[PDB]
Write a protein that binds this ligand. Structure first.
Ligand SMILES: CCCCC/C=C\C/C=C\CCCCCCCC(=O)O
Lengths: 48, 49
């Protein structure tokens, strides 16, 4: 029921036990040196 | 000796250890360890350093 303004799509492959690291505060090998999300994120995370 | 031991206790006789006089640089675990569940309760994990 909405319309979206500035849409971007990221994409990568990791290992299962690291999916929990894709979030605002996670401080791990993936969130520290590889990929980090803001603390005021607006969007959706999707894994499979 | 903790995460890389040889035998762990039985949950009915769980073990308990004491840690003192050491440096907590957990970044040594990134190379070999892989945790599926990690949750801190009374502290934010971005301030464990
Ligand atoms: C030997 C125990 C020393 C205890 C020191 C006190 C607090 C330290 C808190 C957490 C240390 C382990 C965090 C797990 C490492 C991040 C997850 C990962 O590996 O990616």
């Amino acid at each position: 029921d909405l319309c979206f303004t500035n849409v971007y799509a990221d994409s990568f492959v990791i290992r299962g036990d690291e999916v929990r690291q894709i979030a605002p505060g996670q401080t791990g090998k993936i969130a520290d040196y590889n990929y980090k999300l803001p603390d005021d994120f607006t969007g959706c995370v999707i894994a499979w | 000796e903790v995460f890389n031991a040889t035998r762990f206790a039985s949950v009915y006789a769980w073990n308990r250890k004491r840690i003192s006089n050491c440096v907590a640089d957990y970044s040594v675990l990134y190379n070999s360890a892989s945790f599926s569940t990690f949750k801190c309760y009374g502290v934010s994990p971005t301030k464990l350093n």
